[PDB]
From Swiss-Prot, chain A:
One of its GO terms (cellular component) is cytosol. Component of the large ribosomal subunit (LSU). Mature yeast ribosomes consist of a small (40S) and a large (60S) subunit. The 40S small subunit contains 1 molecule of ribosomal RNA (18S rRNA) and 33 different proteins (encoded by 57 genes). The large 60S subunit contains 3 rRNA molecules (25S, 5.8S and 5S rRNA) and 46 different proteins (encoded by 81 genes). It comes from Saccharomyces cerevisiae (strain ATCC 204508 / S288c). The chain holds residues 11 to 100 of 199 of the full protein. This is Large ribosomal subunit protein eL13A. Transmembrane segments: none annotated. The lineage of its organism: Eukaryota, Fungi, Dikarya, Ascomycota, Saccharomycotina. The keyword DNA damage does not apply. It comes from the Eukaryota. Belongs to the eukaryotic ribosomal protein eL13 family. Component of the ribosome, a large ribonucleoprotein complex responsible for the synthesis of proteins in the cell. The small ribosomal subunit (SSU) binds messenger RNAs (mRNAs) and translates the encoded message by selecting cognate aminoacyl-transfer RNA (tRNA) molecules. The large subunit (LSU) contains the ribosomal catalytic site termed the peptidyl transferase center (PTC), which catalyzes the formation of peptide bonds, thereby polymerizing the amino acids delivered by tRNAs into a polypeptide chain.
From Swiss-Prot, chain B:
Binds 1 zinc ion per subunit. Belongs to the eukaryotic ribosomal protein eL37 family. Signal peptide: none annotated. GO terms for molecular function: RNA binding; rRNA binding; structural constituent of ribosome; zinc ion binding. Pfam families: Ribosomal_L37e. Component of the ribosome, a large ribonucleoprotein complex responsible for the synthesis of proteins in the cell. The small ribosomal subunit (SSU) binds messenger RNAs (mRNAs) and translates the encoded message by selecting cognate aminoacyl-transfer RNA (tRNA) molecules. The large subunit (LSU) contains the ribosomal catalytic site termed the peptidyl transferase center (PTC), which catalyzes the formation of peptide bonds, thereby polymerizing the amino acids delivered by tRNAs into a polypeptide chain. This is Large ribosomal subunit protein eL37A. PANTHER family: 60S RIBOSOMAL PROTEIN L37, RIBOSOMAL PROTEIN L37.
UniProtKB/Swiss-Prot annotation, chain C:
This is Large ribosomal subunit protein uL29A. HAMAP family: Ribosomal_uL29. The modification Phosphoserine is found at residues 12, 49. Its main location: cytoplasm. It comes from Saccharomyces cerevisiae (strain ATCC 204508 / S288c) (Baker's yeast).
UniProtKB/Swiss-Prot annotation, chain D:
It comes from Saccharomyces cerevisiae (strain ATCC 204508 / S288c). GO terms for biological process: cytoplasmic translation; ribosomal large subunit biogenesis. Its main location: cytoplasm. NCBIfam families: rplX_A_E (TIGR01080). Component of the ribosome, a large ribonucleoprotein complex responsible for the synthesis of proteins in the cell. The small ribosomal subunit (SSU) binds messenger RNAs (mRNAs) and translates the encoded message by selecting cognate aminoacyl-transfer RNA (tRNA) molecules. The large subunit (LSU) contains the ribosomal catalytic site termed the peptidyl transferase center (PTC), which catalyzes the formation of peptide bonds, thereby polymerizing the amino acids delivered by tRNAs into a polypeptide chain. The keyword Metal-binding does not apply. GO terms for molecular function: RNA binding; structural constituent of ribosome. This is Large ribosomal subunit protein uL24A. The keyword Hydrolase does not apply. Keywords: Cytoplasm, Ribonucleoprotein, Ribosomal protein.
Length: 90, 85, 119, 126, 207
RNA sequence: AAACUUUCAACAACGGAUCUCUUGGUUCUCGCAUCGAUGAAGAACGCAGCGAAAUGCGAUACGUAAUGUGAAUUGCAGAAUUCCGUGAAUCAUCGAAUCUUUGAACGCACAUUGCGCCCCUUGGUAUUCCAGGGGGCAUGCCUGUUUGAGCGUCAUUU
RNA sequence: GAAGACAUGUCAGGUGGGGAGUUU
RNA sequence: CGUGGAGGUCAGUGACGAAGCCUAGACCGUAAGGUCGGGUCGAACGGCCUCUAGUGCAGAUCUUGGUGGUAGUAGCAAAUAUUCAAAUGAGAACUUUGAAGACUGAAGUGGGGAAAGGUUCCACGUCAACAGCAGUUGGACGUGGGUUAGUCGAUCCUAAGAGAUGGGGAAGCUCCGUUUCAAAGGCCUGAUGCAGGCCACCAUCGAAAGGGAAUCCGGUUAAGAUUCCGGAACCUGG
RNA sequence: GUCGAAUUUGGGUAUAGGGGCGAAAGACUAAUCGAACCAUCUAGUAGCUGGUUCCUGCCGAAGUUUCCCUCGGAUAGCAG
RNA sequence: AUAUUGGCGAGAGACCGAUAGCGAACAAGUACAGUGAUGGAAAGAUGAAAAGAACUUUGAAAAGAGAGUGAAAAAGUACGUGAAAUUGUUGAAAGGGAAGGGCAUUUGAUCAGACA
RNA sequence: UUGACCUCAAAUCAGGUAGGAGUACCCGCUGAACUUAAGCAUAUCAAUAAGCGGAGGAAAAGAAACCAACCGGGAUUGC
């Protein structure tokens, strides 16, 4: 079963830029680090448990800390964002 | 006869020089150019006519103003005059 | 050979006009000799001198007009920036910096802080 | 070897740049070395050739000849030296299209700009 | 180019038995009119099976296989027999593998490194390079492949204190780290047993 | 035996085939976003001392203005004068000018360098006619200024 | 003046080699 | 076995001659092919282990280019026809002059014109390219000159017809409409700010043979004229 | 054959492709018409005609068994 | 973070190398054909320097023979190297309505090698 | 009789904007056939070819009337 009864040749994409894209990403990261020199370049993320029991056994990183978690930690969501702590209201 | 005698009466003219392009494609009866689309505001062009597009695409002519835009952008569209050291 | 632009810059408008008239007369006289002489390369210098005088006069007039419109809003378009159509219509520096009072208060209260993970 | 990415080792690019270099850039291309005596005097190895300079031929059939430069043919990349000519069949004399890279300068034309250049290049004229 | 050989409006004239049925170019009064097109055997037409960019250029090789190949290449250097057959002037060197003091890594200038290599028995190998320099044969000279030369000794170091830059300019000589040894450098041309000059720190760190 | 047909070897004839190079072509990768009514692209016509084509330029016309290098351009003539220089370059750079008609093309048209209107200035003794020069008159829509219409309609009244 | 809740966008029934695809 | 390239190697060959080509010259292998001798030639190429492919031609009425027999052959036979003397020229039937003989026979092989062609028009020099022979000549080649308008045409007006505008459809490129269901113009002229007054209709293009405001003769160039010069009139705006 | 007319014709205008036109022949529609030309889908579709390029050594066939709108495909055999 | 057969400025390719590679390595979207939408080519190389044959002679001239530059004129503006098809001159051979080929030898020409 | 409010006009009014070219990428509309199924209409070709409208270096989308049924995941986009 092969799906090639279309003009697939017009949509063929070859990732020649794999090395070039990697170099650009590394250069971009360094550029931001220079721009973000005082900060660690990323926001701390929470501990999260996954759905889909096939994966719930493994802990995973979340998008951001909940409002209740931030409040219990002894700060505020607005201050947390400026301090570098990811916040997720959902 | 459809042969050579028919060609004898070929003394009239259907097309004429076009004001916009002057390619001799301005029809007299229709008062329109079949090549550049005159007098229609939009220049006539089509994707199926790849060769036709090249013959009239930008850069084929003089490019009196567009040719200098790159240098001005490189200089940041600076204004004034040189400080002379 | 040829009229120097800086020398002309020190002359007055009437002097520039007189010099232009004299150069035009000289160019006309030389052209009469060109059709007789086998070759008259000297004609090139006077033709460019006329252009230099005209450019100097135009520059002086434009600079005078600029003073006539110095600091006045809604000035002649030709004196305005020639950057490009898109940039001309783009929001100005002040317009792009417009921030609502709510956002101003939010930024003032909680501006981005400089923090490092050291201890 | 090549390190910076702003330069290229492509043969075609270099050939096109050399054969299409503008007259202003061809001045640097048409440079000649100075004699060891001049090197010790001014403390410099080479300088761009000038029409009023004197150069000694050190290569080719005309080796050993010397004279003042007559003209600098930047268009032809060659240099003409006074008295370095070949006689045609009809007796006409034509200059020899020499190259500054094959000649040694014996005396410089110390123009003000040239004087500044020598000092600019770490020279020792004064 | 995918568009090469197809930028024409040639059409077949049918099987009227006066000329081949190859699609002939239209128009007239230009010479090209009436010429065949779109054929692989036709002049100026698209070649048979035009080359495509999605051809498999890179080849995947197992990591364990790569490590095995590197280890095998390393061993050939210590035999002292494959090196001679490879074409390295290791006849007069004291012993194989060659181990040099850690001070070799701290050499600053190229002249000092060249002198040290000459004194440590690499003089013959260094002289082998710069003597075989010959112009490339064939069309390869068009694409910057002009000059070719034989490989020189390979210096292995544990720390980069300037040795890599000192030996950069000397022709044929190459430098590599123990933690980043290359099979291509160790066995150029699929031939094992390249002459390698190990340093004390590099030799100890190999364990 | 000569004449004539054919093969080989040397040389010489259409031919440019083989070999060697290419300011050339094709593919990948990298960095950026910069056309136009403040008149885009394109097109017609002209500009060099000697130029047909290319390129550049637009009656300031293979260029004008400003800055960098400092001794040319070159096929011939010519000028060189600027050669210890506020200065030669078919030089580079380029922020200042010119930028014919046409072209979204914009006074109306256009197989016509055709046919109109407004303002300023000049001459023919002319506000009325003609002519020379300069500045203007295209369509859709937005904010504001002015002048108007609608027993749509309010108070104000005689 | 005549006319007028009638004539005058969406589905459904009829006719439709005037026109299109296909089979023989 | 052989070819275009790549990794390695021979510290390979090479301006005291690389490659290619010619060579009833030779050697090796059953063969694909490899090597050497000589001539030409002028700047890169060579043995071997591997990798790589746009890698091997006698056919496809195969694509481009070039060249033979047919062949110095068919043919250069419509339109009645040329001949003698002189001149230029190296060269003359075709060029120029003189003479003779003929043709178009006014519905001509003449004098003008529109469309068309656009410098073919005239002057000087030339015969390498063309005038299916030839050519001193040419609508050929190289260098120059020539087109003069108030009175001739375009320009102005309108027919078939084309064609915007306010609007009506169309997702849209754009289709319909020429007064249709528009608040659609400035003209007389007085103290030009403001007063009085008539008309009802409202782009534009569309003929060098439709209509039209007006010039006739004489002379003149190598080539222009009713346009240029002499003379004599006419029409329009003032 | 006709030649005082349903005459011939110059310029302009209108009719443009499943359309136009046709005193009507599938006749004309720019030497192309029972459906014009230009560029793209398109290197369209074949159970069909033709071609399919260097050397040597070894081995080495087949026309019958079944099915298929079957009188080109699957299948056993031969054989490697 | 993602796409990019267009524009600008660059770095590279186990890519092609004048019938190849973009149609265009060159005054290429040029010459040229069509009213037209469109179609659409062929064409790189002297030598390092033109140093491009001054000069004598034959010929009207084109050009040839001498002389000269150049390393080369077997580089002469028809120019790097210079193949086959086809053609001419010189040397050899054969030929009574075909030629060409195979085994075999005579005659003519030509040719390599080594000799206590 | 005078001055206002609402609508609608005229302005070569003062200050502005829009057409168009390019279009490889994007955002929408519109939109086939050849071919394939050894015939062919469902279907494939294809939500493609052509045509039309709209901007930028990216465009679009974007902070869930979402996914899950979990010990819950937590803007959008890409591999």
């Amino acid at each position: 079963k092969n799906h090639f009864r279309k003009h697939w040749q017009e949509r063929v994409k070859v990732h020649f830029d794999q090395a070039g894209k990697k170099v650009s990403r590394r250069n971009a990261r360094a550029t931001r680090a220079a721009k973000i020199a005082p900060r660690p370049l990323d926001l701390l993320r929470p501990v999260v448990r996954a759905p889909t029991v096939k994966y719930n056994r493994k802990v995973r990183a979340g998008r951001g800390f909940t409002l209740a978690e931030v409040k219990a930690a002894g700060l505020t969501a607005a201050y947390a964002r400026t301090i570098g702590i990811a916040v997720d209201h959902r | 006869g459809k042969g050579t005698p028919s060609f004898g009466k070929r003394h009239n003219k259907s097309h004429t020089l076009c004001n916009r392009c002057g390619r001799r494609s301005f029809h007299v009866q229709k008062k329109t150019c079949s090549s550049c689309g005159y007098p229609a505001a939009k220049t006539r062009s089509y994707n199926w006519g790849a060769k036709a597009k090249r013959r009239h695409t930008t850069g084929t002519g003089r490019m009196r103003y567009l040719k200098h835009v790159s240098r001005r952008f490189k200089n940041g569209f600076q204004t004034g005059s040189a400080s002379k050291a | 050979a040829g009229v120097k632009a800086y020398e002309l810059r020190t002359k007055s408008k009437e002097q520039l006009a007189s010099q232009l008239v004299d150069l035009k007369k000289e160019l006309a006289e030389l052209k009469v000799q060109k059709l007789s002489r086998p070759s008259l390369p000297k004609i090139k210098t006077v033709r460019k001198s006329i252009a230099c005088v005209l450019t100097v006069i135009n520059e002086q007039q434009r600079e005078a007009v600029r003073q006539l419109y110095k600091g006045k809003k809604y000035q002649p378009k030709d004196l305005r920036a020639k950057k490009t159509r898109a940039l001309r219509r783009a929001l100005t520096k002040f317009e792009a910096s417009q921030v609502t009072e709510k956002q101003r208060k939010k930024q003032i209260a909680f501006p981005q802080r400089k923090y490092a993970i050291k201890a | 070897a090549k390190q910076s990415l702003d330069v290229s080792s492509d043969r075609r690019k270099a050939r096109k740049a050399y054969f299409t270099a503008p007259s202003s850039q061809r001045r640097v291309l048409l440079s000649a070395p100075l004699s060891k005596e001049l090197r010790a005097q001014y403390g410099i190895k080479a300088l761009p050739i000038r029409r009023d300079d004197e150069v000694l031929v050190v290569r080719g059939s005309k080796k050993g000849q010397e004279g003042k430069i007559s003209s600098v043919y930047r268009l032809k990349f060659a240099v003409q030296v006074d008295k370095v000519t070949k006689e045609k069949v009809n007796g006409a004399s034509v200059p020899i299209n020499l190259h500054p890279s094959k000649l040694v300068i014996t005396k410089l034309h110390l123009d003000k700009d040239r004087k500044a250049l020598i000092q600019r290049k770490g020279g020792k004229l004064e | 180019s995918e568009k090469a050989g197809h930028q024409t409006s040639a059409e077949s004239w049918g099987t009227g038995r006066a000329v081949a049925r190859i699609p002939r170019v239209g128009g007239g009064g230009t010479g090209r009119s009436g010429q065949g097109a779109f054929g692989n055997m036709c002049r100026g037409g698209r070649m048979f099976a035009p080359t495509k960019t999605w051809r498999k250029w890179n080849v995947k090789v197992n990591h364990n296989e790569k490590r095995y190949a590197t280890a095998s290449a390393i061993a050939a250097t210590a035999v002292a027999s494959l090196v001679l057959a490879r074409g390295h002037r290791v006849e007069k060197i004291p012993e194989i593998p060659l181990v040099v003091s850690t001070d070799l890594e701290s050499i600053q200038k190229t002249k000092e490194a060249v002198a040290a290599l000459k004194a440590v028995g690499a003089h013959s190998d260094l002289l082998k390079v710069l003597k075989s320099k010959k112009l490339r044969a064939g069309k390869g000279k068009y694409r910057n492949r002009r000059w070719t030369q034989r490989r020189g000794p390979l210096v292995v170091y544990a720390e980069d204190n300037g040795i890599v830059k000192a030996l950069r300019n000397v022709p044929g000589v190459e430098t590599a780290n123990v933690a980043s040894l290359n099979l291509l450098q160790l066995a150029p041309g699929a031939h094992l047993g390249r002459f390698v000059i190990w340093t004390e720190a590099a030799f100890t760190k190999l364990d």
